[PDB]
Design a protein around this ligand. Structure first.
Ligand SMILES: [Mn+2]
Ligand SMILES: [Mn+2]
Ligand SMILES: [Mn+2]
Ligand SMILES: [Mn+2]
Lengths: 376, 378
């Protein structure tokens, strides 16, 4: 009734299909989480799915990856209900289209310089948009969607090496074409796959660089979940940074609970509900600074390397237990948690072998080898 | 027997599918010639077809173009006989008996939200292997598709069309580099397909044959429309260059008047041979030059009835060209009926043009370019 003027969109990024495909424990992770994401898409009778990059972990997906994926899309993206919106732009029923950009992982490759998405696109399940051609200047054109009276101008930028893109912005070469008919009638949506934090001098892209006419920015390269839209104080658009749906690196950010988004756009206004992903392997992480507690740990003490070591076993022992606790209400979560302990030995301390650790936890952790880390 | 060590390859370029699709007379030209080309491929039981660009006239082919094409490929490229060679490289796309390897030209170039090419659609349907497309911005690294049939091995290198200025710069700056195979560099026949300007246009608006790595054996040069399909040796580099024509005339130029051909290329071990095959379905195109300053006896600079005397000779030249056409079409039942005809008129001295209207009209039904039948210059 009123919903016929509202876009319902499932928003996800960095699904990383096929990540650690061959590993015995973790190898089915991404395929299950993808099942959840598509299932959510279907339950919420979403208008279309919108992905921010890195759908595939490898730019040349294994037959297995690519087939599992197609099977899943076949399962959840087809159905009785007709697509309820239309593309005003150029170029067995499909009921849930998928719009995606390419990341740095699923980037273009091969003799034809295609992308995994392009295979998907070929099968009929995906609309690859956002891929830039030009060398000298980047002109971004919008896919124009329209549902009832409300109109989305969907802008994309498939992953580009940050150094280049920074340079391009600085030299005023990145320009965003606004629609011909009635610039102001459109909700301006922008999906990008780039570095948001600081890495080098130019190894990121400052939020300020993006045209202020943009309404919502889906920022997709960063794996840490920040899916709840937050306003940028200089430009005033919202930035949503959905997580990834797998942990591909044991970092503070990646420990934040993974979510997908349910995004509604009516007229030129939007709202973002977050949905938690239940099938994601848990990842608990804690820091331990030794220099912070002289009472418990003594710098010069030949039995201190043994006293520390004994506390780590306790910290890890409790993390593992808190895990078994949460998994109580969650039957969907895989059984063996990822666990990491970061140890800052600043002062007068020294490392120790992870072997004894690796062994004692072998069957209660999914990363027996990488369970601990040291630094100055 | 011995043929099981020999690649048979049909070679073509600038087919320009859908060119003047809508025109009443010429609109089915390209689709018929494509039919011939594929039919030749099939008769000669070729191993695979190899195209040098501009398969489609438009980078966003009309439904009609794209469907006719797929119908044709479906017809001639499928069959009982299995593919007899294998790809040692990574990826390749009812049996397919004649694969098509192609590069993109400047017409069928990448476009759209996904930055794909018409070939990529074809590739999707299963009929084409798009190769040669470069990605990088700063440097071009060309990698070879590795084919092998029996004992003989082709390292097929491609370069999808690039704007000439950029490519020239790249070559000069030593940024274009061709990766040679890992295993046994010397075991391979080195084949290179490119779609670029060969003649002189600007200072850098072409690519000098010398720029290409001398380790290449045969170069299929595909952007140029003028048929020069018979391989000829380059005196500095020593590779052969074959420049198959286009299979349609898209511009009334001297070059385009040369009789169109496709190639039948054989590679055994590291040696090759190129038979040329003439395309019979191509609309004829006759063209003659007429320099007025060359004949003062027949044409007088100051003479109010000279513009009428010239005009009367043109009608005769054209009248005879048209007749020589009807002559050749005698043995050729496949050739479309209405010839293209052009007369180039150099009025250097003290002459002046005249209206093509009377001409356009008098030939309307005996020529396929009534409007463009004549040209003037200094
Ligand atoms: Mn990622
Ligand atoms: Mn990424
Ligand atoms: Mn051409
Ligand atoms: Mn061309």
């Amino acid at each position: 009734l009123d919903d016929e003027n509202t876009f319902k969109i499932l928003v996800a990024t960095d699904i990383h299909l096929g990540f650690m495909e061959k590993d015995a424990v973790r190898g089915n992770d991404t395929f299950v989480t993808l099942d959840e994401i598509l299932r959510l898409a279907q339950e919420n009778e979403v208008d279309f799915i919108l992905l921010g990059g890195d759908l595939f972990h490898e730019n040349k997906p294994s037959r297995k990856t690519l087939h599992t994926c197609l099977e899943l899309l076949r399962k959840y993206c087809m159905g009785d209900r007709p697509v309820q919106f239309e593309i005003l732009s150029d170029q067995l029923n499909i009921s849930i289209p998928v719009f995606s950009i390419h990341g740095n992982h699923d980037d273009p490759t091969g003799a034809d310089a295609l992308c995994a998405l392009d295979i998907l696109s070929c099968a009929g399940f995906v609309n690859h948009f956002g891929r830039s051609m030009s060398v000298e200047k980047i002109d971004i054109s919008p896919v124009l969607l329209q549902k009832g009276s409300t109109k989305i101008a969907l802008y994309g930028l498939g992953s580009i090496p940050d150094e280049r893109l920074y340079r391009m912005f600085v030299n005023k070469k990145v320009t965003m074409l606004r629609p011909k008919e009635d610039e102001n009638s459109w909700f301006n949506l922008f999906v990008i796959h780039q570095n948001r934090s600081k890495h080098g001098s130019t190894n990121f892209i400052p939020e300020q660089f993006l045209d202020d006419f943009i309404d919502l920015v889906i920022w997709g390269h960063e794996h840490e979940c920040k899916i709840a839209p937050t306003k940028n104080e200089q430009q005033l658009f919202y930035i949503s940074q959905p997580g990834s749906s797998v942990v591909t690196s044991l970092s503070p950010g990646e420990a934040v609970k993974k979510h997908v988004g349910l995004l509604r756009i009516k007229g030129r206004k939007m709202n973002m509900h977050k949905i938690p992903l239940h099938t994601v392997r848990q990842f608990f992480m804690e820091d331990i600074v030794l220099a912070n507690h002289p009472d418990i740990f003594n710098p010069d003490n030949p039995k201190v390397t043994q006293a520390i070591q004994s506390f780590c076993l306790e910290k890890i022992e409790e993390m593992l237990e808190n895990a078994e606790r949460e998994r109580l209400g969650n039957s969907h979560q895989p059984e063996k948690p990822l666990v990491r302990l970061r140890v800052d030995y600043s002062g007068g301390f020294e490392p120790f072998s992870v072997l004894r650790f690796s062994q004692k936890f072998v069957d209660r952790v999914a990363n027996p080898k990488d369970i601990i880390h040291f630094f100055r």
